[PDB]
A paper describes a structure:
The RAS family of oncogenic proteins is important as therapy targets because of the frequency of activating mutations in almost all major cancers. All family members function by signal transduction to the nucleus of cells via interaction with effectors (such as RAF, RALGDS, and PI3K) that catalyze phosphorylation of downstream proteins. When KRAS is bound to GDP, the protein is in the inactive state and becomes activated by nucleotide exchange from GDP to GTP. Mutant RAS proteins remain in the active state and hydrolyze GTP at a much slower rate than wild-type (WT) RAS.
As a comparison with the KRAS169Q61H crystals, we also determined crystal structures of WT KRAS188, mutant KRAS188G12V, and KRAS188G12D (all isoform 4B) with a GTP analog (GppNHp), using crystallization conditions similar to those described previously for full-length KRAS188G12D. A further comparison was carried out between the switch regions of the two full-length KRAS structures (G12V and G12D) with our new KRAS169Q61H structure (amino acids 1–169). Both KRAS169Q61H and KRAS188G12V lack stabilization in the switch II region, and this instability could be attributed to the lack of a Mg ion binding to the switch II.
Numbering used by the authors: 0 to 61, 67 to 171
The structure:
Amino acid sequence: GSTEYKLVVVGAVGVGKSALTIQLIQNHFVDEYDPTIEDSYRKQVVIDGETCLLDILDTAGQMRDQYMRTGEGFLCVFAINNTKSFEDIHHYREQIKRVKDSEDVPMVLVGNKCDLPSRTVDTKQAQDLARSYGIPFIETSAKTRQGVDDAFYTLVREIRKHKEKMS
Ligand SMILES: Nc1nc2c(ncn2[C@@H]2O[C@H](COP(=O)(O)OP(=O)(O)NP(=O)(O)O)[C@@H](O)[C@H]2O)c(=O)[nH]1
Ligand SMILES: [Mg+2]
Protein backbone atom coordinates (compact mmCIF):
# COMPACT_ATOMS: atom_id res chain seq x y z
CA GLY A 1 0.00 0.00 0.00
CA SER A 2 1.10 3.54 -0.94
CA THR A 3 1.24 6.23 1.83
CA GLU A 4 -2.14 7.06 3.33
CA TYR A 5 -2.96 10.69 4.52
CA LYS A 6 -5.95 11.38 6.75
CA LEU A 7 -7.38 14.81 5.79
CA VAL A 8 -10.22 16.53 7.63
CA VAL A 9 -12.35 19.38 6.07
CA VAL A 10 -13.71 21.76 8.80
CA GLY A 11 -15.57 25.11 8.81
CA ALA A 12 -18.92 26.81 9.42
CA VAL A 13 -22.28 25.77 8.01
CA GLY A 14 -22.75 26.44 4.27
CA VAL A 15 -19.18 27.54 3.42
CA GLY A 16 -18.63 24.73 0.77
CA LYS A 17 -16.89 21.86 2.54
CA SER A 18 -19.05 19.22 0.74
CA ALA A 19 -18.91 21.11 -2.63
CA LEU A 20 -15.06 21.23 -2.56
CA THR A 21 -14.79 17.54 -1.62
CA ILE A 22 -17.30 16.37 -4.26
CA GLN A 23 -15.42 18.35 -7.00
CA LEU A 24 -12.18 16.58 -5.99
CA ILE A 25 -13.71 13.08 -5.91
CA GLN A 26 -16.55 13.19 -8.62
CA ASN A 27 -15.82 16.26 -10.80
CA HIS A 28 -19.16 18.02 -10.54
CA PHE A 29 -21.01 20.71 -8.59
CA VAL A 30 -24.64 21.10 -7.39
CA ASP A 31 -26.59 24.13 -6.22
CA GLU A 32 -28.87 22.19 -3.89
CA TYR A 33 -28.05 22.25 -0.24
CA ASP A 34 -27.89 18.94 1.68
CA PRO A 35 -26.48 19.44 5.20
CA THR A 36 -23.80 17.04 6.29
CA ILE A 37 -23.80 14.77 9.36
CA GLU A 38 -20.55 13.00 8.66
CA ASP A 39 -19.25 11.81 5.28
CA SER A 40 -16.03 10.19 4.18
CA TYR A 41 -14.25 9.52 0.87
CA ARG A 42 -11.18 7.84 -0.53
CA LYS A 43 -9.13 8.80 -3.60
CA GLN A 44 -5.88 7.74 -5.22
CA VAL A 45 -3.73 10.52 -6.63
CA VAL A 46 -0.17 11.26 -7.60
CA ILE A 47 1.49 14.25 -5.95
CA ASP A 48 5.09 15.25 -6.70
CA GLY A 49 5.71 11.89 -8.38
CA GLU A 50 4.37 10.02 -5.33
CA THR A 51 1.18 7.92 -5.22
CA CYS A 52 -0.95 8.92 -2.14
CA LEU A 53 -4.16 7.42 -0.81
CA LEU A 54 -6.25 10.31 0.50
CA ASP A 55 -8.67 9.41 3.23
CA ILE A 56 -11.01 12.46 3.55
CA LEU A 57 -13.40 13.27 6.35
CA ASP A 58 -16.17 15.81 5.43
CA THR A 59 -17.55 17.19 8.71
CA ALA A 60 -20.76 18.94 9.83
CA GLY A 61 -20.94 22.75 10.02
CA GLN A 62 -23.06 22.62 13.27
CA MET A 63 -18.06 14.69 17.42
CA ARG A 64 -15.37 17.36 17.27
CA ASP A 65 -12.70 15.90 19.64
CA GLN A 66 -12.52 12.57 17.82
CA TYR A 67 -11.93 13.94 14.30
CA MET A 68 -9.38 16.32 15.64
CA ARG A 69 -7.54 13.37 17.23
CA THR A 70 -7.57 11.20 14.05
CA GLY A 71 -6.73 13.80 11.37
CA GLU A 72 -3.17 14.28 10.23
CA GLY A 73 -4.00 17.64 8.49
CA PHE A 74 -6.94 20.06 8.40
CA LEU A 75 -8.52 22.00 5.50
CA CYS A 76 -9.95 25.09 7.32
CA VAL A 77 -12.63 26.50 5.00
CA PHE A 78 -14.41 29.86 5.17
CA ALA A 79 -16.54 31.65 2.58
CA ILE A 80 -15.45 35.11 1.25
CA ASN A 81 -19.02 36.51 1.81
CA ASN A 82 -19.32 35.08 5.30
CA THR A 83 -17.52 37.18 8.00
CA LYS A 84 -18.50 34.91 10.93
CA SER A 85 -17.08 31.84 9.02
CA PHE A 86 -13.73 33.67 8.83
CA GLU A 87 -13.79 34.61 12.49
CA ASP A 88 -14.70 30.93 13.35
CA ILE A 89 -11.23 29.76 12.06
CA HIS A 90 -9.58 31.09 15.25
CA HIS A 91 -11.92 28.88 17.35
CA TYR A 92 -11.34 25.70 15.20
CA ARG A 93 -7.60 26.14 15.40
CA GLU A 94 -7.58 26.56 19.24
CA GLN A 95 -9.66 23.42 19.64
CA ILE A 96 -7.25 21.54 17.31
CA LYS A 97 -4.06 22.59 19.13
CA ARG A 98 -5.65 21.68 22.51
CA VAL A 99 -6.71 18.17 21.33
CA LYS A 100 -3.27 17.48 19.70
CA ASP A 101 -1.40 19.05 22.58
CA SER A 102 0.80 20.89 20.08
CA GLU A 103 1.56 24.23 18.47
CA ASP A 104 2.35 22.51 15.13
CA VAL A 105 -0.52 20.87 13.27
CA PRO A 106 -0.59 20.69 9.43
CA MET A 107 -3.28 23.08 8.15
CA VAL A 108 -4.26 25.05 5.04
CA LEU A 109 -6.58 28.15 5.12
CA VAL A 110 -9.12 28.03 2.22
CA GLY A 111 -11.25 31.00 1.15
CA ASN A 112 -14.07 29.57 -0.88
CA LYS A 113 -16.74 31.07 -3.20
CA CYS A 114 -14.24 33.43 -4.91
CA ASP A 115 -16.68 33.50 -7.91
CA LEU A 116 -19.19 35.64 -5.99
CA PRO A 117 -19.44 39.51 -6.17
CA SER A 118 -19.43 41.25 -2.86
CA ARG A 119 -16.72 39.92 -0.70
CA THR A 120 -16.89 40.91 2.89
CA VAL A 121 -13.61 39.24 3.84
CA ASP A 122 -10.63 40.71 1.95
CA THR A 123 -7.65 38.72 0.60
CA LYS A 124 -5.17 40.74 2.72
CA GLN A 125 -6.93 39.94 5.94
CA ALA A 126 -6.86 36.24 5.12
CA GLN A 127 -3.15 36.34 3.95
CA ASP A 128 -2.33 38.13 7.22
CA LEU A 129 -4.01 35.43 9.33
CA ALA A 130 -2.25 32.59 7.44
CA ARG A 131 1.13 34.42 7.91
CA SER A 132 0.45 34.62 11.72
CA TYR A 133 -0.30 30.87 11.88
CA GLY A 134 2.60 29.92 9.54
CA ILE A 135 0.38 28.05 7.03
CA PRO A 136 -0.57 28.41 3.35
CA PHE A 137 -3.65 30.36 2.05
CA ILE A 138 -5.48 29.23 -1.12
CA GLU A 139 -8.50 30.89 -2.79
CA THR A 140 -11.01 28.46 -4.36
CA SER A 141 -14.37 28.22 -6.18
CA ALA A 142 -16.09 24.83 -5.95
CA LYS A 143 -18.54 26.20 -8.58
CA THR A 144 -15.82 26.52 -11.23
CA ARG A 145 -13.22 24.09 -9.76
CA GLN A 146 -10.64 26.94 -9.52
CA GLY A 147 -7.99 26.02 -6.87
CA VAL A 148 -9.64 22.76 -5.68
CA ASP A 149 -6.82 20.37 -6.53
CA ASP A 150 -4.19 22.89 -5.25
CA ALA A 151 -5.96 23.16 -1.86
CA PHE A 152 -5.92 19.38 -1.15
CA TYR A 153 -2.44 18.74 -2.69
CA THR A 154 -0.93 21.60 -0.67
CA LEU A 155 -2.35 20.06 2.56
CA VAL A 156 -0.55 16.74 1.73
CA ARG A 157 2.71 18.72 1.18
CA GLU A 158 2.26 20.29 4.64
CA ILE A 159 1.80 16.83 6.24
CA ARG A 160 5.01 15.59 4.45
CA LYS A 161 6.98 18.58 5.81
CA HIS A 162 5.69 17.94 9.32
CA LYS A 163 6.76 14.24 9.26
CA GLU A 164 10.25 15.34 8.03
CA LYS A 165 10.55 17.94 10.79
CA MET A 166 9.21 15.66 13.60
CA SER A 167 11.86 13.22 12.48
N1 LIG B 1 -21.28 30.40 -5.87
C1 LIG B 1 -20.78 29.37 -5.14
N2 LIG B 1 -21.59 28.62 -4.35
C2 LIG B 1 -21.10 27.55 -3.65
C3 LIG B 1 -19.64 27.29 -3.60
N3 LIG B 1 -19.43 26.21 -2.79
C4 LIG B 1 -20.65 25.86 -2.32
N4 LIG B 1 -21.61 26.69 -2.84
C5 LIG B 1 -23.07 26.60 -2.51
O1 LIG B 1 -23.25 26.87 -1.10
C6 LIG B 1 -24.29 25.99 -0.56
C7 LIG B 1 -23.59 25.15 0.50
O2 LIG B 1 -22.62 24.19 0.01
P1 LIG B 1 -22.16 22.93 0.79
O3 LIG B 1 -21.10 22.17 0.11
O4 LIG B 1 -23.46 22.13 1.13
O5 LIG B 1 -21.65 23.55 2.22
P2 LIG B 1 -21.13 22.82 3.56
O6 LIG B 1 -19.96 23.60 4.11
O7 LIG B 1 -20.80 21.35 3.16
N5 LIG B 1 -22.61 22.84 4.48
P3 LIG B 1 -22.68 21.87 5.89
O8 LIG B 1 -21.72 22.39 6.99
O9 LIG B 1 -24.24 22.02 6.32
O10 LIG B 1 -22.38 20.44 5.61
C8 LIG B 1 -24.86 25.22 -1.74
O11 LIG B 1 -25.97 25.95 -2.26
C9 LIG B 1 -23.68 25.23 -2.72
O12 LIG B 1 -24.04 25.07 -4.04
C10 LIG B 1 -18.84 28.14 -4.47
O13 LIG B 1 -17.54 28.06 -4.56
N6 LIG B 1 -19.43 29.18 -5.12
MG1 LIG C 1 -21.45 19.60 3.99
